Amino acid sequence: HKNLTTNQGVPVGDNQNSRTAGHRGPSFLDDYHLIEKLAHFDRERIPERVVHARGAGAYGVFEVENSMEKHTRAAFLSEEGKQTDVFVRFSTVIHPKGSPETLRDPRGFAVKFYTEEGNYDLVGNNLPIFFIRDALKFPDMVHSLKPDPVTNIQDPDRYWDFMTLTPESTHMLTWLFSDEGIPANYAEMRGSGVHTFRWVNKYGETKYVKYHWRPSEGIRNLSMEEAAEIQANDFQHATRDLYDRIEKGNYPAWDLYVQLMPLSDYDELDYDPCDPTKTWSEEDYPLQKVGRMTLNRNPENFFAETEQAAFTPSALVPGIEASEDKLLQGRLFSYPDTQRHRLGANYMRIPVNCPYAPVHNNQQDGFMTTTRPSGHINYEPNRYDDQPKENPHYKESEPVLHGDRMVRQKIEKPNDFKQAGEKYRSYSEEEKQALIKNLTADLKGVNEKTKLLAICNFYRADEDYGQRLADSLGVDIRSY
Amino acid sequence: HKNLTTNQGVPVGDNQNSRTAGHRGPSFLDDYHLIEKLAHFDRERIPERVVHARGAGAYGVFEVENSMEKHTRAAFLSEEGKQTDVFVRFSTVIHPKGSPETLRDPRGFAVKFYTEEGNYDLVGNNLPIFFIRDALKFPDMVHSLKPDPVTNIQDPDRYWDFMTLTPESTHMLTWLFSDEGIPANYAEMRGSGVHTFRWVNKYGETKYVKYHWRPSEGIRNLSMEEAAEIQANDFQHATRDLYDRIEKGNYPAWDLYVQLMPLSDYDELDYDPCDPTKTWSEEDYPLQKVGRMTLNRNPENFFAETEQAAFTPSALVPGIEASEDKLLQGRLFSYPDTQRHRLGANYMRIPVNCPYAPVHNNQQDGFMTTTRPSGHINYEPNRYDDQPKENPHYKESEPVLHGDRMVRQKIEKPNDFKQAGEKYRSYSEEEKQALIKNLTADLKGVNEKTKLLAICNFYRADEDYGQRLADSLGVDIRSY
Amino acid sequence: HKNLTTNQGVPVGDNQNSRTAGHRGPSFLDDYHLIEKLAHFDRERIPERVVHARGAGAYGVFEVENSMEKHTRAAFLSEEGKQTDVFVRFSTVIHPKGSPETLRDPRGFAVKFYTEEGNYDLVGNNLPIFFIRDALKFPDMVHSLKPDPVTNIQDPDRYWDFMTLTPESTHMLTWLFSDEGIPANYAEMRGSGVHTFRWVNKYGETKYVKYHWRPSEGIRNLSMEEAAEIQANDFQHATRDLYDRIEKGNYPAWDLYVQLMPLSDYDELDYDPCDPTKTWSEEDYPLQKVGRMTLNRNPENFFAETEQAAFTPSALVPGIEASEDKLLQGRLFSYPDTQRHRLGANYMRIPVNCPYAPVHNNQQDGFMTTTRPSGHINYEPNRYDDQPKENPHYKESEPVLHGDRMVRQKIEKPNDFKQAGEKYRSYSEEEKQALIKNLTADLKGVNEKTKLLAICNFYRADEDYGQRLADSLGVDIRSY
Amino acid sequence: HKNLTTNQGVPVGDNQNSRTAGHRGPSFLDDYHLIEKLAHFDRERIPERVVHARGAGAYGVFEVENSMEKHTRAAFLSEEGKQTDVFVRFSTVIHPKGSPETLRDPRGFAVKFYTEEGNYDLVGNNLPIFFIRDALKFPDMVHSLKPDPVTNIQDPDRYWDFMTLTPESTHMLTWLFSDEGIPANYAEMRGSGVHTFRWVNKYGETKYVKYHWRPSEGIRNLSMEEAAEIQANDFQHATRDLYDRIEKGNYPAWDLYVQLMPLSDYDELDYDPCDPTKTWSEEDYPLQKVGRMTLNRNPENFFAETEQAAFTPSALVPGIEASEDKLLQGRLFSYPDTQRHRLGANYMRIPVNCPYAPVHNNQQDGFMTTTRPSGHINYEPNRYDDQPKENPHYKESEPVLHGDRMVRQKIEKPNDFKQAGEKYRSYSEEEKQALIKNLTADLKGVNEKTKLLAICNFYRADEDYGQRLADSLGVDIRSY
Ligand code: HEM
Ligand code: HEM
Ligand SMILES: [Cl-]
Ligand SMILES: [Cl-]
Ligand SMILES: [Cl-]
């Protein structure tokens, strides 16, 4: 048995009735419990994520099967059997909190590893490539996909205007308009790091790496009709499914594989291996098993832990570094930036975001300082041997720069269409039909000129691809 | 033709490429256009409304048919034919911003009238009563209805626990579990002030008043199966329908009626006329036509005008005052309190929220001061005849207090069940069948003891009502 | 020995050099440690307090000498010898952070008692009365006293305009313009509750109470010239003194006394005992010793503890209640209101603001949720016997209302001048000379009409008082 | 004559009395004017600037005497007689908002030019060099100079610990401990760009540039004793002096000069010309007159205009670019980053911060959106010719990078002592005595080892310098 109290710790005498002039009169200003309770209620909500606002979280463990020390000094990967706690958030992308999990969208697949050398965040999606290759375009792309700023409803005419004028999107659209554009839930779902990163070993040697997550449950997708039948009765079916699996002891898992590529392989490929519109061949750069992640614990509070969770691709650990990928480069900035706005300056002290490894530094103050700081010395260098100092065992690598000037210029070998064609041809006939069906339903209402440009882009990917789409849309492409 | 610019007004040379070390190298910090554009992107979102987060707005006009000056000095009601501009937001209640408009919920019906004596907000719902009668309970009620704080899914076991232990909710639930719990859209929908207010005329005479909005388009509702079939294909159908009517010149309208009641009728009744769980008889207090409101204009920008719209029941104008209704009393505080958090201290300068009437006062500063203030004199009294002064022609009435002490105590004559029984019996047989069906589907999974208490509450309302519900839930109540 | 780390817990390799294109080239965006460290620096500051921005804090203990249970059920006062931890902040009033502590101003004297029945804040000043008697005037008053909104310099012509048109200020000005307007430091200083409060005992009986703190160190004050000489060499002398006394073990202390007055004495006094422009005669309502407070510990971090400290007069504990004082009434609202803005919705979780008594309630979420919440049940009533419940042993009293109606009307018997005359006459001749001197230097540049009004107000207080001031300002008042 | 109103535009009946239960009873919650007026009061303050918090602003004009088009395409410099409007803020550095203007500190000298090609901010100080050369050290440097985080008082032991361990500070300390460390006011004061920037002409040719502002009123300083005498009677004397000069038509002015240096001179020098601890010889790189800035207009409101003013070194206009200076490089980021926090995401719409040049882009939303946005198209590329497009006439230059790797490494030729020794010798004997006096008073209480290191640093600058300082501090340095 417990008293209900104010936030001052005074037991509440009456949690039913306001204080008033007799039993039916107007209310008094001197009712501290009323005003405190209402004022906190009035302040419960914080801004949702700018994208990926709808999602669900879980905790688990990652266990190493094959140590990776030949290729990376990363501590969490250093020995067979090593277990590292994780927190994971899965999400849709474009619509707000509260929106259905049956809509077409990439899915987010964000993993926070609480390592002995700091937190490492791998901020992936299910699909392994992206629509764009430079972060300067990201607000433009998002604004085109988001609901129209007048009507508040998503408009294909708007995003297809953008995508068509951005032909590097063609590979990604070829994946997203398969039925994999609507994963059945979060458990039966692919994961991908998307970018190339750099792995750096104890000798200072560097390889390029890609990450892949393979579901123990298998990959399963929904047709447009299957999605509509679910949407009719449950607009949070994937959140529900994740929670329910874990509560029942049916823990979903993913095996982590990597591909590894010598830096020197740049020069003989017909694409840029750091162009995030590209995959790497699994025949030429085979998947290598690393370990397995199992999610086995639901959060205790959705707001405190899942809504407030903060991931960033710049949360890198020794042995794992960014590549030169221009899309990645902007993400390094945008995440902690948006998080300072969304969550406050001190968002890294929110429990789910805290490292297991020690934090010592000379930062101070900021809104909601709750950590009980002490000491006179908040600057370095200083004369005190016991105060925190830099440690040169933990320097990052020094990537070679091939460029001689500060430039704004597209990468060489963009190759916008080749891999889209390759993906198209890799589809079964049944898969090709679904792609054409899904594209047609999306394109049939859009501006004719934009519709034609879309057909043209897909035709450059593969002639059959583009001709089938033209036929299905009733567009005659003879004069071209 | 226009240049794309930074916020400094410098034309942008290249809106495609980040600044990098050659065409493929990493990105430079000295790229003001990238950082500015990303940072503003990262800050687009503000907190959504704590309740009624999903909604849609429109502008229009209210015209007086019958001047109301014998009963209220309100300027906007003073003459036949007098037109007043309005802004209106319609909404659901419980789920977040992107959530479907096919869910069961009251609907918000908020009207801002830009009058010559200031803005008047009538912050209504479609349904004419409420679940509770004291604002102290509102965070409890909402927390029970909202998604479970662990799972992020709404749970009937939670809100039926609260509602059953809050028997004053019994009238409201008898309306909400009719098919009127799911209006077809925002146009074919009732509106209500819910509370009794006080109207005060030029002689200082006061009557109690209730407001009702009657749709020109008629009232239409959805069965659970009809709601599911719409939900399958459109989670924003009511937002779409409002915009589309207005874009096509098919402007929806509502006629405004009032009921008026002498203060002295308090003793003539077996309920409190300021208990918001109660309606007033239309036989005994007939509806009197006031005028008509027609919505004819969509906003130019959804975020700036609809998302940032701020209404409050305390935005009263001369001749219209609060009643002693303890639920209303809390609302007077909570809206501008939540708005200061949600929108900023200076939220009343946001264009949609600005009055048409002049604003002059001694308030100053606050975040985002954009109004070009001037002058040395920001205090009153002051010796300067030209500075703003108080005006005694605009004093409020002085309501009589019947209570002799500051108390926390329920109103007398709560009468929690009588009007619920009356509403039940007023239903057609078809309507009664839908109510039972809708209650049953909601109750069938809840805790058995709570289930029984719900049945009991409805049985106290009407024996047939409660017995039918018990039969439909397979609960044997012989022996109570 | 410790590593400097990022907020991700990664050891920092180099805390001296930014990442750049060779040893002298421009900087890279991929420098997580630079960006994180700068971005947090950029966010260190929060808004200062709207008034009382300059101040200093200390911890200590209050011990009861005489139990107060005949008069109040307050727990912290129940027994001889009972010790309660306190936090205290002392302050100036008008100028910002960083301003000198040699300026004329009331001094704040704010005490938080961490009691077994919740936190009790007594938010006093050194002087025992105030300038105004209704909170509606507080922003006007402050704006007049604050630096001019154009020039950023305080202007006597502005605040004497307000004060002279607000004759209730006349008693307060009679104390503030003694040399007690400029206390020597925070230790050698009076403290006062200012307001009448209500004390309620175990039988439900109520008395009015005033609080007084008497320094162990005695009261000492600075002449205008003494203040200037300090200001020359130390603009933070009182913050320095408080810290230094404590660091050297010379702990300052105050004895707490009360006056007590029957409610019934209202009707036979020639002033309102809840008018905060009034004191109560110490002959007629003698000082009664309660206990002693000793300050013996400096805070560990000034920002986290003293800057973030939040006091409110509405932090009342059982046995201690507001009076009807209309100035007090506004404070109940304003403090927690400002604090939600200044410190965040969860400011009560900041360590210095936390109660020692347990906190349990159904509030949730809000910016910077750090407390690891859990559970499904965030609503009451609920079916769970273990969840927090109200406790009827802790109801507040029910003050009798003597008023008929909701009114906006000055109190009866304002008596603006009588006590100001009595205080004048109580001054030694030296003290009377200082008063006249300090008033004269402040008034001599003000608008002649405002100057004459000031003289009149003081002449109504006491003829000799007003005549002396007139003589000293060279103003001939014979014709009046 | 005007009505005082609420923010809803309702005339106020009574601005003196709260609404209460009779003339003396407690206060009612239904008092919208009280709550609104107090709640806005409670939200007036915003965070002060993290450094340079104490300052004053004025408007004026800059006029070109000698067109600069041979060296820069900057529009505002393109023709003789061309006038550009400016806003200017002057400041101190380390202490908070209300702190005295008589303290030792660099002074800020920030100029915002409202040009036809956008706003150009030149964010200078009075002194022409800085303490450090890499922005990574800036929060360290500030934390050491700021008041101790425990005591709230500045401590020379703390900043001298840092500066002595940061020998690059030696030149700057040599200027700051002359009596120029305390300018007499803001008018009689030097201005400096400090950094080398790049000027780029219409042919794409680049030179290094330094900026210098020469006061029409001359340079005048205060001794320590002169400063104390002013501080005794006025802690805002420079704020006062600037306002007063302008109000009486005694407009202060500064002539702008530049030095220009070929990029190819890097190897001809024994220091790095982009090391901000270094000046360039006026013999070798002569001062060239550009034009004159006159300040002739005080702001209308100090908060709206001066407190909310936002400058950034990254507000560069075509023809003027950053140099590789690593200190500059961090500032490009930190200013808009801190401003978004301090002022809100939309701080560029605050009037003083608005460009005169047109602003069009695809940014949207954010707190306090007051600009009435419209249109469907908030993304680029898009199919619409009339929407804003990039303009390739406004590309920035492409600086040559001399580095081949991403490194964290100090510049070559730091040369920490040489220019300090040159400055020392350039002082008159009277100036040398003041420098020694000021350094001695600052150093005499610091830790002995730190004291010795300071002496060593200054002795490396010049033997006489160091020996005089050692003699004056009583430190025997013969064994070294
Ligand atoms: C320029 C490109 C991109 C930008 C600018 C960007 C920016 C952002 C931002 C600002 C957020 C909100 C973060 C928060 O509020 O805590 C976010 C979330 C997210 N992004 Fe991205 N993103 C980009 C590309 C990508 C890519 C390529 C992926 C996958 C590789 C991805 C996966 C995600 C995920 C999964 C989340 C949600 C993380 C969570 O669960 O909280 N993003 N992104
Ligand atoms: C209508 C009257 C008043 C209003 C509206 C008002 C409002 C405020 C506000 C808003 C603050 C800032 C609080 C914070 O940020 O924590 C403050 C501080 C303070 N006020 Fe008042 N105040 C009033 C009268 C008084 C009175 C009568 C006293 C003493 C009797 C007083 C003593 C103080 C003190 C000591 C502080 C500083 C709190 C601290 O140390 O942190 N005030 N006041
Ligand atoms: Cl921010
Ligand atoms: Cl640090
Ligand atoms: Cl006002």
Ligand SMILES: [Cl-]
């Ligand atoms: Cl707030």
Ligand SMILES: [Cl-]
């Ligand atoms: Cl609660």
Ligand SMILES: [Cl-]
């Ligand atoms: Cl843009």
Ligand code: NA
């Ligand atoms: Na191994």
Ligand code: NA
């Ligand atoms: Na010329």
